[PDB]
Ligand SMILES: Nc1nc2c(ncn2[C@@H]2O[C@H](COP(=O)(O)OP(=O)(O)NP(=O)(O)O)[C@@H](O)[C@H]2O)c(=O)[nH]1
Ligand SMILES: [Ca+2]
Ligand SMILES: [Ca+2]
Ligand SMILES: [Ca+2]
Ligand SMILES: [Mg+2]
C-alpha cells in the first residue's frame with residue numbers, strides 16, 4: 001500500500017508531539033517532555049485509500065537543530081507547527097520553511113501550516129496573519145488543538161492531500 005512520510009517540525013513547546021500522539025493514540029499529553037526524534041506508524045483510510053502514515057516527530061529545541069538536515073531529506077510532506085499564543089514560534093516558521101526549501105531544492109514541497117493551541121485565548125497570532133504566511137508559501141493554513149482534538153485529523157489528512165497534489 002501507499003506510504004506517506006510525514007514530518008512534523010516547529011519550535012519547542014508548540015505541540016508537535018501532542019498533535020501526533022492525539023492523532024495516533026487518541027489521548028492528550030498534558031506534560032512537556034522535549035523530543036529528540038520519535039517515529040509513529042499507523043494504517044489508516046484517507047479518502048477511500050488504505051495507506052500507511054509514517055510520522056517523524058522532531059525536536060523543536062535548538063540544541064538538536066543539527067538533526068534537521070537528515071529528516072528534511074527523507075520526508076515527503078511537512079507539518080509546520082506554531083502555537084497561536086507564541087508569536088516567536090510563528091516567526092520561526094520561515095526558518096523551518098527556508099531549510100526545507102534549501103534541502104529539498106524546491107519551493108513546491110508539500111506542506112501545511114498549523115496554528116496549534118487554538119483552545120487557548122492568549123492569542124497573539126491572528127488567523128489572517130497565518131493565512132497570509134501560508135498563502136505566500138502556496139499552502140493551506142489550519143488551526144488545531146491537541147487538547148480538544150479540534151482540527152487534528154484534518155491537519156494530517158490535509159498534508160496527505162497536499163502530497164497527492166505533488
Ligand atoms: N492548551 C493546549 N496545550 C497544548 C496543546 N498542544 C500541546 N500543549 C501543551 O504544550 C506543551 C508542549 O507540548 P509538546 O507536544 O511536548 O510540544 P513539542 O512541540 O513537541 N515540544 P519539543 O519540540 O520540545 O518536542 C505540553 O504541556 C502540552 O500539553 C494544545 O493544543 N492546547
Ligand atoms: Ca511514499
Ligand atoms: Ca493526559
Ligand atoms: Ca511552496
Ligand atoms: Mg515534542
Ligand SMILES: [Mg+2]
Nearest residue numbers: 124125126129
Ligand atoms: Mg499582533
